[PDB]
């Protein structure tokens, strides 16, 4: 009856491999959660550090990478939940020509107490590592757009600047918009 014991051992070992794999996945998700809390901002000002810019630009130039989603940041501890969507390859009218930087209104745990629709002024900023002349855009949310209503789902459709920054100017050395495969975006949401 050694065959029975060996088959039972085979069963328990395959089970241990499966369960162990699931635990490894859950651990990875926990680490990602910790990274998300580490980079969360609660004053409406969020600074996004994009590393491996050239590699991610090659990924965006192909079909594997569409866009990047920034860590969630908040206007206040109990304020609006926001994140950013970045197209290094472009999007819509800016596809293959510009950086596309959109803002995403997400479902907050406390948004049942928040005023709607979202009206706060939004400012995008591609940072020059040098002293000055970094690119700055700003917009008022289109209150008639469904992208700023209270989220009935997890996230609303992103809205922002598809022609945010010309990809051509990124290569130029006059401004240090990319240094060591790392560029910094900055979102500033007005307190309201």
């Amino acid at each position: 009856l050694d065959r029975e014991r060996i088959l039972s051992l085979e069963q328990r070992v395959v089970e241990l491999q499966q369960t162990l794999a699931q635990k490894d996945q859950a651990l990875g998700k926990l680490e990602q959660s910790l990274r998300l809390m580490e980079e969360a901002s609660f004053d409406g000002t969020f600074l996004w550090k994009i590393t491996n810019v050239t590699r991610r630009c090659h990924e965006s130039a192909c079909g594997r990478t569409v866009s990047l989603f920034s860590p969630a940041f908040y206007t206040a501890k109990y304020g609006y939940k926001l994140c950013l969507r970045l197209y290094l390859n472009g999007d819509g009218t800016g596809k293959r020509t510009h950086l596309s930087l959109f803002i995403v209104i997400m479902r907050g745990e406390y948004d049942a107490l928040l005023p709607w629709p979202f009206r706060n002024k939004v400012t995008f900023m591609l940072l020059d590592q040098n002293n000055r002349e970094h690119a700055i855009d700003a917009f008022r949310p289109d209150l008639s757009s469904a992208s700023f209503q209270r989220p009935q789902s997890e996230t609303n459709v992103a809205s922002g600047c598809p022609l945010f920054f010309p990809l051509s100017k990124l290569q130029s050395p006059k401004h240090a918009y990319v240094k060591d495969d790392t560029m910094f975006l900055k979102c500033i949401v007005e307190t309201s």
Binding site: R85, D91, G92, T93, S100, F102, D137, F139, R140, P141, D142, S145, S147, V157, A158, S159, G160, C161, P162
Partner: peptide, 6 residues
């Protein structure tokens, strides 16, 4: 100038 993401 918000543009719906496409």
């Amino acid at each position: 100038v918000p543009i719906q993401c496409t």
